Design a protein around this ligand. Structure first.
Ligand SMILES: CO[C@H]1/C=C\C=C(/C)C(=O)NC2=CC(=O)C(NCCCN(C)C)=C(C[C@@H](C)C[C@H](OC)[C@H](O)[C@@H](C)/C=C(\C)[C@@H]1OC(N)=O)C2=O
Ligand SMILES: CO[C@H]1/C=C\C=C(/C)C(=O)NC2=CC(=O)C(NCCCN(C)C)=C(C[C@@H](C)C[C@H](OC)[C@H](O)[C@@H](C)/C=C(\C)[C@@H]1OC(N)=O)C2=O
Lengths: 205, 205
């Protein structure tokens, strides 16, 4: 409304069970943390599917894997449906999914971190290798927003005063620098690219 | 509205002339920067007057000077009328007062920084000795808010999810550490306390 208004950031606490899951993920040892990439690519593929199916009723859909050695970040990007402010607030922190508790119960009953996907909480596997995660998204029905969390009990929602889609940036943990290496990413992408219908472009830089 | 909502910060650009004045104040040499204290005490006294006069139609009103050697800050506090969010946004950055340009014109015509008070912009003299200023206020008609600026072209407005009044905290410049000394403050307060009707309490700490 104000001419001089530049932007806004809102802080939200995580729903109790989401907070527990994030602590369990970021501050607990697991043997194969590399499963995070399969989860992010799978989410990107689902976002591309949502807009592709919307086209039946109501451009090349693709997924990009962008390592950045200088800022020590790994980004998974898509030109899928995108998320509104409400989608980010409601589905990425404040409303508990049945899968949050159910995944923690499955791990407790001897399950594996690779099972995360069936519980609708696979996004949070990013915290196996990252100490901070940034979600920048644009849906056709809303302005673009930036979600951010360092798994400290809260997340932020910031305005951007972007083309349709989502960019997920992972600030990597000191000992998880192997996911910046092009050879390592090419291998990881090939390991599960067999069942992704969309093109997965690794940006060499 | 949301149960998990914690707080919000909004960024605003300064109105062009306010931005010019702040650059002129913070990044220009003046011989007697000590005039800032007289200005802050005078503003506090005016805020106490506004509520005292409101009492005629519709507690001890006093002013406190709080030095803090550890955080390198000087605070001027009052239990005056206080400011709403709108008061902070409109009168502390986005709406140009006629006094903004007129004070810069008076300095240009040979005026002195001590004249600032007659132009309704005396608050900005805080930047003669401070690199950052924080305004925390509570008015009876609104929740309490925090205004903040480092004279970088913008200011912030942050929610506090406080008793009626205002607290102005100055983060002092490296060479302006003399305004933390109790002896120096006692002198400065005495220099103009003759015309302030309210009690001025220096908190020794
Ligand atoms: C940031 O990553 C994603 C956002 C949340 C991710 C969460 C918490 C997670 O860990 N897993 C989920 C994976 C899903 O695939 C999925 N979709 C339903 C599939 C049915 N089963 C299989 C779940 C949901 C339900 C719900 C959140 C979906 C979304 O808001 C309604 C959007 O419709 C969807 C298009 C946005 C995304 C998939 C985001 O990815 C990108 N790149 O956009 C999940 O919960
Ligand atoms: C943060 O400090 C103050 C806020 C802004 C200060 C500005 C920009 C400044 O540099 N100088 C001003 C000094 C004034 O005295 C003054 N009041 C009218 C007196 C008539 N002439 C003499 C001006 C105004 C007009 C207007 C802003 C007033 C306020 O919003 C309507 C409130 O009524 C008032 C009670 C709040 C304060 C005085 C604040 O202090 C404390 N401690 O609360 C000034 O502009």
């Amino acid at each position: 409304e104000n001419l001089y208004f530049q932007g806004m950031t809102e802080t939200f606490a995580f729903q109790a069970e989401i907070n527990q899951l994030m602590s369990l993920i970021i501050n607990t040892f697991y043997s194969n943390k590399e499963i995070f990439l399969r989860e992010l690519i799978s989410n990107a593929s689902d976002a591309c599917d949502k807009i592709r199916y919307q086209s039946l009723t109501d451009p090349r859909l693709c997924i990009r894997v962008v390592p950045d050695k200088e800022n020590k970040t790994l980004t998974v990007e898509d030109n899928g449906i995108g998320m509104t402010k409400a989608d980010l607030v409601n589905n990425l922190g404040t409303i508990a999914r049945s899968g949050t508790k159910a995944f923690m119960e499955a791990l407790e009953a001897g399950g594996d971190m690779s099972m995360i996907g069936q519980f609708g909480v696979g996004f949070y596997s990013a915290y196996l290798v990252a100490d901070r995660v940034t979600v920048t998204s644009k849906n056709n029905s809303d302005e673009s927003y930036v979600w951010e969390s360092s798994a400290g009990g809260t997340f932020t929602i910031t305005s951007t005063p972007m083309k349709r889609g989502t960019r997920i940036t992972l600030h990597l943990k000191e000992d998880q620098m192997e996911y910046l290496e092009p050879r390592r990413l090419k291998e990881l992408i090939k390991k599960h690219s067999e069942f992704i219908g969309y093109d997965i472009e690794l940006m060499v830089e």
